Amino acid sequence: LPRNTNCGGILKEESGVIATYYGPKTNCVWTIQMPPEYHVRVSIQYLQLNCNKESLEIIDGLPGSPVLGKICEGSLMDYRSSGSIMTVKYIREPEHPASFYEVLYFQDPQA
Amino acid sequence: LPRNTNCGGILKEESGVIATYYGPKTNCVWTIQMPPEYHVRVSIQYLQLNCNKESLEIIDGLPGSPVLGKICEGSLMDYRSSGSIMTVKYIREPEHPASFYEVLYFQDPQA
């Protein structure tokens, strides 16, 4: 599965992985955009962030849309978008080096 | 809003709150059951559990159904069931006194 480790971007792959970006930017916004009648499924098997210095947010659309969660510790997380777009946003404090994270996404259904 | 602090049970109110149960049981399973064409919406504004000793799990149906998350730290969490039932399960270690938690649920749509 194509692994994305850029700080954000619009993603159109039918499936892929978002994993930790290690550069200087402190706010990365990945927007997953599927064809019109499709949905996006997002899975996070295990997440363990420092909730004091960083977080991951799942947004049901473009930035500005309803938030589905701002999460820093959990596992077995499954999110489905209500439309064709979902955004994943990671944020950290400048002084803090990013923790490891891996987010899987799928077009739902697959084609 | 009717507050439930029993260790589990089947809940049929059109809206309510699940909050910390303080008795000896270590596994509480709340199953929210709405009328047939409805869904359940579950909201958790802030959650801060000791992920080493306890957790909250959201299940898209009766126990045995797909898990939507096993979460111990986050905020702004919004879950919608795919059918008429959703289960919330809390678990803790026997030695550990339960942390505060508050889970809101709504019939979606309201009637």
Side-chain angles (χ1 to χ4, degrees):
Chain A
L1 297 177
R3 187 189 204 84
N4 191 294
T5 58
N6 284 334
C7 181
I10 290 169
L11 304 180
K12 300 254 263 247
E13 291 283 358
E14 197 176 330
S15 62
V17 181
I18 299 165
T20 299
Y21 153 83
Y22 280 117
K25 276 157 279 175
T26 64
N27 238 76
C28 306
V29 182
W30 293 269
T31 291
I32 302 137
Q33 184 188 138
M34 293 300 157
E37 264 176 332
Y38 292 86
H39 301 258
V40 179
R41 175 86 62 125
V42 155
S43 308
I44 307 182
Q45 260 290 318
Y46 298 129
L47 182 70
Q48 298 169 292
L49 301 183
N50 187 320
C51 227
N52 260 108
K53 334 230 142 26
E54 67 196 320
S55 63
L56 185 83
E57 175 170 20
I58 311 295
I59 301 157
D60 191 13
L62 297 163
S65 284
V67 175
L68 293 177
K70 181 167 197 162
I71 58 224
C72 11
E73 186 144 32
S75 65
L76 302 187
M77 295 164 281
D78 193 58
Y79 295 96
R80 191 160 131 129
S81 72
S82 26
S84 285
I85 301 171
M86 182 113 98
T87 292
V88 178
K89 176 175 276 183
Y90 169 83
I91 282 135
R92 75 171 158 98
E93 287 270 63
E95 318 211 16
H96 181 248
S99 313
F100 170 83
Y101 55 80
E102 227 159 51
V103 172
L104 305 168
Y105 59 97
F106 302 87
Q107 181 179 125
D108 187 351
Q110 297 272 301
Chain B
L1 297 177
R3 187 189 204 84
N4 191 294
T5 58
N6 284 334
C7 181
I10 290 169
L11 304 180
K12 300 254 263 247
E13 291 283 358
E14 197 176 330
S15 62
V17 181
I18 299 165
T20 299
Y21 153 83
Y22 280 117
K25 276 157 279 175
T26 64
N27 238 76
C28 306
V29 182
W30 293 269
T31 291
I32 302 137
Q33 184 188 138
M34 293 300 157
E37 264 176 332
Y38 292 86
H39 301 258
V40 179
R41 175 86 62 125
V42 155
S43 308
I44 307 182
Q45 260 290 318
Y46 298 129
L47 182 70
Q48 298 169 292
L49 301 183
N50 187 320
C51 227
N52 260 108
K53 334 230 142 26
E54 67 196 320
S55 63
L56 185 83
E57 175 170 20
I58 311 295
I59 301 157
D60 191 13
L62 297 163
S65 284
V67 175
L68 293 177
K70 181 167 197 162
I71 58 224
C72 11
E73 186 144 32
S75 65
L76 302 187
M77 295 164 281
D78 193 58
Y79 295 96
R80 191 160 131 129
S81 72
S82 26
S84 285
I85 301 171
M86 182 113 98
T87 292
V88 178
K89 176 175 276 183
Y90 169 83
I91 282 135
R92 75 171 158 98
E93 287 270 63
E95 318 211 16
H96 181 248
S99 313
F100 170 83
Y101 55 80
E102 227 159 51
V103 172
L104 305 168
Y105 59 97
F106 302 87
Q107 181 179 125
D108 187 351
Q110 297 272 301

